[PDB]
DNA sequence: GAGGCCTTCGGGCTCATAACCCGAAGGGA
DNA sequence: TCTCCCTTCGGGTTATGAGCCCGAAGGCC
């Protein structure tokens, strides 16, 4: 009906939406030989970007995403997907390789200290300011 | 931003949607093919056409044209769908994440443009209004071949 | 990983189908029983795309596979630049590994051969398509 | 007979066995909206190629690339050529001989309108463009000079 | 049976994509 | 005395794909 080959259809589909919102292009490649999943056309500057999607977990009222390169590296940007809350985090290379086995997303209603990947949170911005730094680095 | 991206945004849409519904979806290899899309319907196949919607400026409402144009020198001429170019027609209004679905006779039924309306206008609505999230008038499409 | 061999027998499926004038789809994620489909004059038919190795004895070459649904499969042959076409009810009616035949040894070549470049059954199958209406 | 955009799909996906045969990436865009129509991963740095086929110019007998995107379906002709920064490389396709010639953004943007490829034998000089036949160890310069 | 609010239609647009035609320019040889 | 060869360069052309504007008709109620 519906697995995991699906559940990570929709998120690189809904990764596409956002970009394509965002006025960017998008790029895809040929098989999956290639490290990264998608590529984005930030106003001129291609951005590698790999999607991923996250599971429910345990009780307990968060999700959970996880890092395997064991079965690749080398991209830009991570992008993690909740289909329940239609919302994506994403991460820079560095802050989603720093991560050691999974990373911990919390949504809930608040009033409590948040994990570190919080600060990822819809965090576009930050794909859209590498566009236009390594623009002046050229 | 410039035309063709309102586009892929509404086909984007229209491809969430069929993957949501569980059904197989075929993206053509270039603006060459006179549909934008297929789903694999339980087995069969259907062509699906894309169009972003308008918000009218006066009259307060959303609309699609169904005719394709050319514009050179001398003069303009049009070109209406066929019956067999797709299998169904669905318009997309953005700000409200609203999908109208349409067969192809109901949509080259109509002359050229077609309004969507959405406020509550008491008056009794055009004929338009009875194709809102029309999916399962695909899916009834789909059983309808799958026999024999 | 051999995925790149996949990879070229598919671009190589697809550059036959625009050599003929076809349309080309493809599916979004592997979940589905095929990987191409052509639109022959309207008419859209589903197709397997698989590639082969050569023979490590004989100066052959060999394809593994792995009604309803299907209705063509293509073979590829990188070297020799050519495609086996097969239906798909020819192509189930085998047991495992089929052996494709291309030197010219004399022989009585397989009933493979009869497949080749038959890119008129894929036509034939989307002008027959028309009569059911 | 179906014409054009299938001609230009051909040249495309005659470009798209090139590369894979030499063993880069190939990334494929959204759609027909943006300035290139393929990317070549090379050695991990990404280079966006400009794809044209060519035609066989009857009274000259060469084979013709415009390289200005002219536009029209506007009753009035606007000739816009590319920018520097549009792409990295434009690739002419001469199908029937299978022949590729590959331009730098820089040299391409050079002409005025039409460059021809001669591909004939004996002639009195040899054209501009003699020089970039096949010319594939250019876009692998660019990409060692890109790293680093 | 009146003055609207309300749809249809069929003219007119603009943006992108792709490939082609040809009459002179005017430097190499 | 190259003076014809033949590359080049701005005018022309076609097809496809997107989404739009607007006003004379005329219906709903
Ligand atoms: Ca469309
Ligand atoms: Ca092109």
Same mark, same amino acid.
């Given at each position: 009906?519906?697995?995991?080959?699906?559940?990570?259809? =929709?998120? #690189?589909?809904?990764? /596409?939406?956002?970009?394509? +919102?965002?006025?960017?292009?998008?790029?895809?490649?040929?098989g999956?030989?290639?490290?990264?999943?998608?590529? @984005?056309?930030?106003?001129? /500057?291609?951005? +590698?970007?790999?999607? +991923?999607?996250?599971?429910?977990?345990?009780?307990?009222?968060?999700?959970?995403?996880?890092?395997?390169?064991?079965?690749?590296?080398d991209?830009?940007?991570?992008?993690?997907?909740?289909?329940?809350?239609?919302? @994506?985090?994403?991460?820079?290379?560095?802050?989603? /390789?720093?991560?050691?086995?999974? =990373?911990?997303?919390?949504?809930?209603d608040?009033?409590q200290?948040?994990?570190?990947? @919080?600060?990822?949170?819809?965090?576009?911005?930050? /794909?859209?300011?590498?566009?236009?730094? #390594?623009?002046?680095?050229?």
């Amino acid at each position: 009906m519906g697995s995991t080959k699906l559940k990570g259809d =929709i998120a #690189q589909q809904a990764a /596409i939406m956002r970009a394509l +919102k965002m006025g960017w292009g998008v790029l895809k490649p040929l098989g999956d030989r290639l490290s990264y999943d998608l590529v @984005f056309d930030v106003e001129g /500057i291609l951005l +590698k970007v790999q999607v +991923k999607s996250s599971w429910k977990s345990e009780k307990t009222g968060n999700y959970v995403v996880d890092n395997r390169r064991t079965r690749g590296n080398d991209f830009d940007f991570a992008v993690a997907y909740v289909e329940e809350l239609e919302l @994506f985090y994403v991460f820079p290379v560095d802050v989603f /390789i720093s991560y050691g086995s999974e =990373i911990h997303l919390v949504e809930t209603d608040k009033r409590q200290r948040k994990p570190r990947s @919080f600060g990822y949170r819809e965090a576009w911005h930050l /794909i859209l300011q590498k566009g236009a730094a #390594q623009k002046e680095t050229s």
